[PDB]
Amino acid sequence: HPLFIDPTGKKAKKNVFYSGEIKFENKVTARAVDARLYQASQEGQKNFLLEGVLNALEQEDFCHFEVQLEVAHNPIHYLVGGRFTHSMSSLEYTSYDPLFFLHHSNVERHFALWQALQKHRGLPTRPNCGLNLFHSPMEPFGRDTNPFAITKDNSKASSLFDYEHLGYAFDDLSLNGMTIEELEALLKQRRSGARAFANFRLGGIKTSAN
Amino acid sequence: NSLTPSEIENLRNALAAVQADKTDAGYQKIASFHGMPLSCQYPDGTAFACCQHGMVTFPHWHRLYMKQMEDALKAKGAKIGIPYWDWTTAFHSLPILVTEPKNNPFHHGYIDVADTKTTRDPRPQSFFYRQIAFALEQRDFCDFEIQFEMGHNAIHSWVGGPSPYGMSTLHYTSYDPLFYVHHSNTDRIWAIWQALQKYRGLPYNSANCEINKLKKPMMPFSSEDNPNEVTKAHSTGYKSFDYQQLNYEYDNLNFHGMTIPQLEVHLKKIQEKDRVFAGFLLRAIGQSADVNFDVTFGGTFCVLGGDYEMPWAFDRLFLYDISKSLVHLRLDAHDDFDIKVTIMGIDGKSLPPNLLPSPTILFKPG
Amino acid sequence: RKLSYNEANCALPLMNQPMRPFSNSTANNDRLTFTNSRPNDVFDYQNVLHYKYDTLNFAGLSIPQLERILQKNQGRDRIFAGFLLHGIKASADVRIYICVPTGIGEENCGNYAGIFSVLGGETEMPWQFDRLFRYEITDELKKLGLNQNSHFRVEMELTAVNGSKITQKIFPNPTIIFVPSD
Amino acid sequence: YFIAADGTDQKMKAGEFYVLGSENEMPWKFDRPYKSDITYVMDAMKLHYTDKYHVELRITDMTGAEVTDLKLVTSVIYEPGIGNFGEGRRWISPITSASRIRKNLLDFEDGEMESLRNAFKQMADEGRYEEIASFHGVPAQCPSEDGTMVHTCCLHGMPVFPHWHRLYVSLVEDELLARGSGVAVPYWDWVEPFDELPRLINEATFYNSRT
Amino acid sequence: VRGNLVRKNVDRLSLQEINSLIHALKRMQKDRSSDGFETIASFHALPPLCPNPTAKHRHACCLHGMATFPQWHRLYVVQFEHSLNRHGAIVGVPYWDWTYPMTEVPGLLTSEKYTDPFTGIETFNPFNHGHISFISPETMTTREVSEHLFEQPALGKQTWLFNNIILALEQTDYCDFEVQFEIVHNSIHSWLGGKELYSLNHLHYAAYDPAFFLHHSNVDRLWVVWQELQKFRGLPAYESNCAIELMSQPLKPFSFGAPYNLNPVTTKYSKPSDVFNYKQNFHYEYDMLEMNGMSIAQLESYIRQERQKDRVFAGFLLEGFGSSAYATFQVCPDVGDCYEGSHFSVLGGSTEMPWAFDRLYKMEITDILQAMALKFDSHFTIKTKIVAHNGTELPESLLPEATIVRIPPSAQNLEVAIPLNRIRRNINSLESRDVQNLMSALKRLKEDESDFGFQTIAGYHGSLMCPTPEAPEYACCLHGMPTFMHWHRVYLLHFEESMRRHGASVAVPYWDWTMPSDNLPSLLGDADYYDAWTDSVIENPFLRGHIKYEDTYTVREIQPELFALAEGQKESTLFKDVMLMFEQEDYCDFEVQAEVIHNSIHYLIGGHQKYAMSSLMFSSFDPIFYVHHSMVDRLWAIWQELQKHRKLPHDKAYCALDQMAFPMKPFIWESNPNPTTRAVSTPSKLFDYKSLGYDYDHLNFHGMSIGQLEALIQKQKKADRVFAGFLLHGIKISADVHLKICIEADCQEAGVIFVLGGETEMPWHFDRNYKMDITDVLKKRNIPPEALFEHDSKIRLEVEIKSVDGAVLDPNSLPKPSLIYAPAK
Amino acid sequence: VRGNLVRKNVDRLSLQEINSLIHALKRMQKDRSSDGFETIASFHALPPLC
Numbered sequence A: 001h002p003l004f005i006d007p008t009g010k011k012a013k014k015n016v017f018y019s020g021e022i023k024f025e026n027k028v029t030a031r032a033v034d035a036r037l038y039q040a041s042q043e044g045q046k047n048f049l050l051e052g053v054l055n056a057l058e059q060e061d062f063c064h065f066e067v068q069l070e071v072a073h074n075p076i077h078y079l080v081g082g083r084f085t086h087s088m089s090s091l092e093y094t095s096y097d098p099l100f101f102l103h104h105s106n107v108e109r110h111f112a113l114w115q116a117l118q119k120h121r122g123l124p125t126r127p128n129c130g131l132n133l134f135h136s137p138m139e140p141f142g143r144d145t146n147p148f149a150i151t152k153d154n155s156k157a158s159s160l161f162d163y164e165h166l167g168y169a170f171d172d173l174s175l176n177g178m179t180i181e182e183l184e185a186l187l188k189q190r191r192s193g194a195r196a197f198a199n200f201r202l203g204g205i206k207t208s209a210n
Numbered sequence B: 001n002s003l004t005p006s007e008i009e010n011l012r013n014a015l016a017a018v019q020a021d022k023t024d025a026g027y028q029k030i031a032s033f034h035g036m037p038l039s040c041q042y043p044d045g046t047a048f049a050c051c052q053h054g055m056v057t058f059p060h061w062h063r064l065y066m067k068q069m070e071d072a073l074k075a076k077g078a079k080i081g082i083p084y085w086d087w088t089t090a091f092h093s094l095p096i097l098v099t100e101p102k103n104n105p106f107h108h109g110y111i112d113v114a115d116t117k118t119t120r121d122p123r124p125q126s127f128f129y130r131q132i133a134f135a136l137e138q139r140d141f142c143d144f145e146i147q148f149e150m151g152h153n154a155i156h157s158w159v160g161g162p163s164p165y166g167m168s169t170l171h172y173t174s175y176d177p178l179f180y181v182h183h184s185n186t187d188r189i190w191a192i193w194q195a196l197q198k199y200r201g202l203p204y205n206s207a208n209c210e211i212n213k214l215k216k217p218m219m220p221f222s223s224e225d226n227p228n229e230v231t232k233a234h235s236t237g238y239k240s241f242d243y244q245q246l247n248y249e250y251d252n253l254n255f256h257g258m259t260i261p262q263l264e265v266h267l268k269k270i271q272e273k274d275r276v277f278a279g280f281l282l283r284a285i286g287q288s289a290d291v292n293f294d295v296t297f298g299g300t301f302c303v304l305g306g307d308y309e310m311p312w313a314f315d316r317l318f319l320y321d322i323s324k325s326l327v328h329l330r331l332d333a334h335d336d337f338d339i340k341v342t343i344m345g346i347d348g349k350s351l352p353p354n355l356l357p358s359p360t361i362l363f364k365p366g
Numbered sequence C: 001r002k003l004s005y006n007e008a009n010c011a012l013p014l015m016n017q018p019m020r021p022f023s024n025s026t027a028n029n030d031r032l033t034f035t036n037s038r039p040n041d042v043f044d045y046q047n048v049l050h051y052k053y054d055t056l057n058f059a060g061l062s063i064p065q066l067e068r069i070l071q072k073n074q075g076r077d078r079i080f081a082g083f084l085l086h087g088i089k090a091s092a093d094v095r096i097y098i099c100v101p102t103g104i105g106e107e108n109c110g111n112y113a114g115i116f117s118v119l120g121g122e123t124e125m126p127w128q129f130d131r132l133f134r135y136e137i138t139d140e141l142k143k144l145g146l147n148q149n150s151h152f153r154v155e156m157e158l159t160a161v162n163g164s165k166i167t168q169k170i171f172p173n174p175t176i177i178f179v180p181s182d
Numbered sequence D: 001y002f003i004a005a006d007g008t009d010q011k012m013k014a015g016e017f018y019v020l021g022s023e024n025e026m027p028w029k030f031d032r033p034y035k036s037d038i039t040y041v042m043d044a045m046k047l048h049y050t051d052k053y054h055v056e057l058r059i060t061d062m063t064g065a066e067v068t069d070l071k072l073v074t075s076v077i078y079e080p081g082i083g084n085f086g087e088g089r090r091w092i093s094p095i096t097s098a099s100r101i102r103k104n105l106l107d108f109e110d111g112e113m114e115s116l117r118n119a120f121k122q123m124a125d126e127g128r129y130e131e132i133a134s135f136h137g138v139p140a141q142c143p144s145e146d147g148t149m150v151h152t153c154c155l156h157g158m159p160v161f162p163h164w165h166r167l168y169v170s171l172v173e174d175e176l177l178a179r180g181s182g183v184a185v186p187y188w189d190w191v192e193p194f195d196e197l198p199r200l201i202n203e204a205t206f207y208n209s210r211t
Numbered sequence E: 001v002r003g004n005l006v007r008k009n010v011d012r013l014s015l016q017e018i019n020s021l022i023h024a025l026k027r028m029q030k031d032r033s034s035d036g037f038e039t040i041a042s043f044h045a046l047p048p049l050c051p052n053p054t055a056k057h058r059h060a061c062c063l064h065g066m067a068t069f070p071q072w073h074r075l076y077v078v079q080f081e082h083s084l085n086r087h088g089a090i091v092g093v094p095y096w097d098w099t100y101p102m103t104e105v106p107g108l109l110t111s112e113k114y115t116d117p118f119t120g121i122e123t124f125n126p127f128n129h130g131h132i133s134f135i136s137p138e139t140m141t142t143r144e145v146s147e148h149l150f151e152q153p154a155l156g157k158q159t160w161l162f163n164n165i166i167l168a169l170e171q172t173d174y175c176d177f178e179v180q181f182e183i184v185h186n187s188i189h190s191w192l193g194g195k196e197l198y199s200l201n202h203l204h205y206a207a208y209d210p211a212f213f214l215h216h217s218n219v220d221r222l223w224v225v226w227q228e229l230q231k232f233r234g235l236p237a238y239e240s241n242c243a244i245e246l247m248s249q250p251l252k253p254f255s256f257g258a259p260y261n262l263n264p265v266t267t268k269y270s271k272p273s274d275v276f277n278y279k280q281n282f283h284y285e286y287d288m289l290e291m292n293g294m295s296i297a298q299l300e301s302y303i304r305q306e307r308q309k310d311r312v313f314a315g316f317l318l319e320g321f322g323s324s325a326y327a328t329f330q331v332c333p334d335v336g337d338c339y340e341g342s343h344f345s346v347l348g349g350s351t352e353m354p355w356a357f358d359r360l361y362k363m364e365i366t367d368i369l370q371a372m373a374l375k376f377d378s379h380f381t382i383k384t385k386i387v388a389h390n391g392t393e394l395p396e397s398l399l400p401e402a403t404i405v406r407i408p409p410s411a412q413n414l415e416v417a418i419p420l421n422r423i424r425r426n427i428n429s430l431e432s433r434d435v436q437n438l439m440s441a442l443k444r445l446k447e448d449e450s451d452f453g454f455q456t457i458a459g460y461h462g463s464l465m466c467p468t469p470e471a472p473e474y475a476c477c478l479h480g481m482p483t484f485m486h487w488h489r490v491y492l493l494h495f496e497e498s499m500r501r502h503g504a505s506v507a508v509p510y511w512d513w514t515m516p517s518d519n520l521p522s523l524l525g526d527a528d529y530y531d532a533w534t535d536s537v538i539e540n541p542f543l544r545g546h547i548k549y550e551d552t553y554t555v556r557e558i559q560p561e562l563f564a565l566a567e568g569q570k571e572s573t574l575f576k577d578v579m580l581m582f583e584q585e586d587y588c589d590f591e592v593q594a595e596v597i598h599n600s601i602h603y604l605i606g607g608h609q610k611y612a613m614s615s616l617m618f619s620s621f622d623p624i625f626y627v628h629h630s631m632v633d634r635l636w637a638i639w640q641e642l643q644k645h646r647k648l649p650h651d652k653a654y655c656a657l658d659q660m661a662f663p664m665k666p667f668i669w670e671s672n673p674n675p676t677t678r679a680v681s682t683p684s685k686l687f688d689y690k691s692l693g694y695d696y697d698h699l700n701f702h703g704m705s706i707g708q709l710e711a712l713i714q715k716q717k718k719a720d721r722v723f724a725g726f727l728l729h730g731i732k733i734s735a736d737v738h739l740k741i742c743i744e745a746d747c748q749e750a751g752v753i754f755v756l757g758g759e760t761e762m763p764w765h766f767d768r769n770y771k772m773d774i775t776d777v778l779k780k781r782n783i784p785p786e787a788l789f790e791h792d793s794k795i796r797l798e799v800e801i802k803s804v805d806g807a808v809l810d811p812n813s814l815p816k817p818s819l820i821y822a823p824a825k
Numbered sequence F: 001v002r003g004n005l006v007r008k009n010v011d012r013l014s015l016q017e018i019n020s021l022i023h024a025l026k027r028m029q030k031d032r033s034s035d036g037f038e039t040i041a042s043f044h045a046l047p048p049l050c
């Protein structure tokens, strides 16, 4: 809802989370939600959101984890934004919607879960994939005008493999009431058998797409 | 009427209580006696229905029968007696207790013998008032009974209608909770009369016609297999006249709005105007049927009966005032008229012809 | 019937002019009738004229019984003769005859159906009923085995209170109305 | 309290009432309205209950000075007669201000007839009843509108026929009772067939028991 | 076997059809045979032949001023019809229907010359006039047109013919139909004929004017319409139960088989009883059986609606005199000022057979009496002035002075075809198109900065603006009193109009909160939606209203108890509360119960907030307000239906007659957008919702018909019940009153009641106490009502009133409850 | 069950029929919803959706 009800009668205030205002150009970012986002239905459609991150959580390389994580993270942007131009549906304006950060706290939470799972046994938590891209301070965090020193100092991707020094922690980081050992059980025993995959060669097409 | 909750409240549970005793009867045995399952035997031991209507000892059996039933709610919070509803007083609709659809013990009964709860089909100044008052008018007991029984069964006719499982039939009537409650009233009417007599110095706890029959004992109330001592004690005719040793009381024997003394004045008042009556001979027939009068409408009255009932014939005529009919045609009991009748069976058909013979037509001044 | 009883929906402009002999200060000196001379004043007799009838039942019938009869009467096919009446300067008796055509050739007439009277005097105030007066000829047609569809006509024979000078064609010929049963 | 209309505007006092009060009296207020009927003054204004009439009041303490201001009176209820057998009432023979009972002529008794005869004889002996018959009769007292001609005063062509004679029977009965009549003017029902005319009017002479 | 002739409307005739008609008439006019025009025109009136052609003394032939008038003239038209069909007309006799308002006299009637399009030759138009043979070769019919022919509908007014044609068609008795019908027909004779001697207004020469037969083609058509109506009503269309005596006497001269009438069919069906079945006997049809474009179905509807009104009539008793004349009557009150009533005409000549109507010819003056501000039984008289054709004023002694008769309204259900966009529907039943229509309409209305706008109309309720601005010192809404329902009814009406003004094809929906609901219905609940037509995402206009002078949007803090109040589903508290409201057989008793429940929902959707539905001052700005008030209004409509089902009053109420007369404050004022809400400002007028032009689909509570409602209502009266009474009044703030029954020092919640109010309020005190039965609550605690009268145990009611902004809570300023025992009757 | 709409000839229309027609089209011309005049007009041609 666009309005926040404070416990004190007072006057209603625009709740900050519904719409992020885009100050340059002009406001605002509303969101045309797609039906796919809601899957409380009896059996089908299957939870494809879960299967997405579930597929990334299985991969034991960083590269392979990364491609499968990133793709699995796109459905949220797409389905929440919808046809509207100024929304999460395009990467041009998606950061202006407060739901963006509520969405990415989860995908980062997924990332943590993965490193935990690799750490479970017995594989690297290090990105062995983009070594050259790790040595440059990522713009505009390494920029001279960064408000916070904590991010400017860690602006290099090289120093971002672990997140303990960044001053935060998640309450759970276990998806859908599963032990780290319970999850790995499913993952390892989804690996067992004959399998078949749709193989996609992906790259930038200058637009969001289904 | 006039009940105060929870006075209503206690009873359902009690009626609920006996729905299954179900050992003594518990209620089905208590039901059988008026009902279908066979009460007794001719010495040949053939099935009879131990129903004691159609005879002059008609009230005692029932008035008791309430007792048997009445006792049956015994110390089950049977904190007050079975109520009565005065069908005499004109009424737009039926009475609650037996209407409320949900969580009510008076809606219906069940019948192990048929696997079903009762079904009832109601069918459309107050008619019964006029009809009962006449009965009160009479002074002979026997004369009274014929009208008293016929005024009575008019309701077993109309409450039940066209369901075999119902109040219209002898066979399964006794099964429906509505039946006793109608009774208290019928019994009450009788009591009022006794008070009447007493007022008039005529016999009330006695009765001179016929000496025959009050002495015959009454089954089942006779039967050894009636595990209530009391009824057997008064199983007889002549006992059971003084309902005082029952022991119950009606809240007040006043017909609507009348002291008993008031009542006689009323009847006495009615009696001034000369009247004209028709009287039929009625006699047993297996089926139960309603009869519709004509000359304009003169009707109507009903007879209660079922298969395997003891046959019966009334000693006396049954009278039905038809004076309003004559005025309707402007006749003077002088100009002479054809009294035309009709007689429907309770089942949808079929108005078969007498059967009953011819109606006499008689005049009372005045 | 839930209709107007102490009032009249019908001809209204007549209802407020006071009765001419009673409204006149002379010779009516009874103050009771004088004040309540206007037609609307006298509708509820009881409250105004302080009188009652012992019973308002007709022919021994309570009013509900009455409307019941009346309703049964409407329950059957009935046939009427319509009469347009007006002020002659003399009172007279008009009798009703049902004229039946004979097969060959055309013929008539006389069968006694009914009778009704019109009242009058030489100096009476002139008048004209603005609706037909009805006489049920239904049962008499039944004794002639006649029908509403059957061919017949209705003739009135005007006999005035003279006993003589039997009057001639003062009123329009009797209309024949058929009311089918509801 | 008075009722005022918008028009004149003219008022008429509708009566007064007193409410009892003191300084430390118990806190009290009615959960019900106090009703005063006010029906007479309404009809007196020739004001139907639908036309706009605002209700107005003035309030005084025990001394002369006026108190201001109040009070909610916004309800004016219309109470239909119990008798009209309308929407809200079952059929009931309405109780009326009815003095005299007129009864069937056949139901008369030996005494009630002689009472009626003697009372009317007195009315006939004095010049009265002929004067009443003359309201209806042939000496014409009705010459309107100009008037060309004079007519008999009774109305016979009109729908107000019953009204006129309803008044006639009233006038003769009122004067008859004053002449000491034991009973009101009886109705005799011709609707019931008869071989002869009633006792009262048929025979030319009666036996008078008193004389 | 040829196929029936069709009687077309005049203006519908094609160039081919007009042509064949004009050439055909040209011949039968030149035709000196008895099949000719002069001869057929002889059949009607002046060259008389009717007693029989041999009589010494003769009267005019045609029947007029009698029951068989339509029959005679029906057969008279087919006489003229068969002539010109055999004279080469491809069609039947055309009509010009006066059913439609007239702007002009038809072309083929009015133009003196006619040019054949096919042969290009200009000739004299045969229909312009007719020759009267016997007078002289040089003698023609002439015409004069009264402006009374060209009248057009006014604001409320309708053309003379329209009102009077319906008035005839309304009649159910043939003779009552005939008398009204004929005089309606007489009007054109006077209006086209005028004061000219050889014209349609003269009985003698009328048939010599060719227009006569076009006009009477329509007269015939009207009878067929009336005939069709009677079929629709299940009445005898082809037979007459009245004037049976006349249906045997054969029509002259048609009855003469010998040389005077050559038509085989016309002689054969010379009996008026046989004249009935026109299609089989005389073989002719009409293109359309319509009164001013109305179907016979639409016709009967209009008729039955008019029968529901309280009407009063001027009655006229007509006896016949030669010659023709027209009468004018005025309605005159006791005070000198007289107003013009309507007028009527008779057709006559010197040779006419004497005629007298045996019934009254009725005229409607009900619209005129209302203009004179006096009722039917008030002192008023009718003066009538009748002038002849001649035309000198004919003595008032000639026709008997008029009578006056009021016919009471007939209370019974009607159809009634109501415009699709004006019915109010259950919000959950709405289709996607209705939803989108409403939303687009509401967004525009909220964006509206005019007085028709949302800010302005929302300002009518919670202001600050009651009379007289700027005095207040007052708030302008009506509660709590009987007139509460009324005020919000116009308010909701006022809202509906503004909706339509921005293109709403949907009336305000109602939300049924008596049914169990897990959450707010989506139309009200959803925050925003995606439009396809614009790529934009836009928010639901039903979600919140902006309060302009407070610079805040409305808020909805929904108490979880709102949904909990109706979770019965039939044991739900709300169901019980409403059924108890429906039981009330007094309007004021109904009102308090109604408004208290209305306050309940107001409170629970926007509770514990300023600028919300719960706060009386600002609640109207939240769009769901109207949807809620659609619901309470429907509840009242159900009650009105329940009231009408019982014999009790529905259209009026005997309560606060002081208020019902005076019209309401914010709407009357000259500064009101639409005139329609101004007209109905009076509470007396909005009592019935149908007259306001809307309706609910549909009117039933839960799954029960109205009959079934009263059944369940009676059943609740058949049990004993125990109520707590609340005399309520205006505290300057909204509040919730919690009720607890205490068997001992131990207390449990018995019920709850809500109160609407704000800083700017209109001070209000209720007439009686609102009731709520705690009988089931008592039955739960096993305390049978007898104990209420018992000294021991001791029981009490405790009330804790809480302010709209919690808690606060308030010390007790409302009177304590009362125990009321209602024994079943 | 609702009776069929009648397509009348223009010049045959009565004042009541004309009026209700005028007001209907006036609203649906102002109606910004899809059931409005502008949107329905689109179905034919120029703002293309086919």
Ligand SMILES: *[C@@H]1O[C@H](CO)[C@@H](O[C@@H]2O[C@H](CO)[C@@H](O[C@@H]3O[C@H](CO)[C@@H](O)[C@H](O[C@H]4O[C@H](CO)[C@@H](O)[C@H](O)[C@@H]4O)[C@@H]3O)[C@H](O)[C@H]2NC(C)=O)[C@H](O)[C@H]1NC(C)=O
Residues within 6 Å of the ligand: C020, C024, C025, C026, C027, C028, D139, D140, D141, D142, D143, D150
């Ligand atoms: C109200 O009533 C008063 C009386 O109560 C009434 O005045 C009366 O009018 C009549 C009618 O004119 C008068 O009648 C008289 O009657 C005697 C016979 O009883 C005649 O001798 C008189 O004239 C007769 O002869 C005339 C020719 O010579 C005739 O032309 C005439 O018709 C008579 O036959 C005379 O008419 C009567 O005297 C008065 N009485 C009084 C007290 O006024 C008055 O008309 C009524 N007012 C209204 C407005 O109705």
Ligand SMILES: *[C@@H]1O[C@H](CO)[C@@H](O[C@@H]2O[C@H](CO)[C@@H](O)[C@H](O)[C@H]2NC(C)=O)[C@H](O)[C@H]1NC(C)=O
Residues within 6 Å of the ligand: C090, C091, C092, C160, C161, C162, C163, C164, C165, C167
């Ligand atoms: C009694 O007979 C006489 C004739 O001797 C009737 O008188 C005529 O009646 C006509 C109307 O029918 C009037 O136009 C005449 O003016 C009357 N003349 C006379 C001298 O009276 C009279 O109508 C008859 N009255 C009755 C009751 O029959």
Ligand SMILES: *[C@@H]1O[C@H](CO)[C@@H](O[C@@H]2O[C@H](CO)[C@@H](O)[C@H](O)[C@H]2NC(C)=O)[C@H](O)[C@H]1NC(C)=O
Residues within 6 Å of the ligand: E321, E322, E323, E388, E390, E391, E392, E394, E395, E398
């Ligand atoms: C105009 O008309 C009236 C009536 O049409 C003429 O007077 C009528 O004359 C006859 C006798 O021939 C009377 O019986 C009628 O009573 C008279 N009229 C009425 C209305 O009743 C009158 O003479 C004519 N005058 C002109 C204009 O020539």
Ligand code: CUO
Residues within 6 Å of the ligand: D136, D154, D156, D165
């Ligand atoms: O005569 Cu005028 O009243 Cu019967």
Ligand code: CUO
Residues within 6 Å of the ligand: E044, E062, E064, E073, E185, E189, E206, E216, E347
């Ligand atoms: O009918 Cu002969 O007059 Cu128009």
Ligand code: CUO
Residues within 6 Å of the ligand: E461, E477, E478, E479, E488, E598, E602, E619, E629
């Ligand atoms: O609006 Cu005035 O209160 Cu619901």
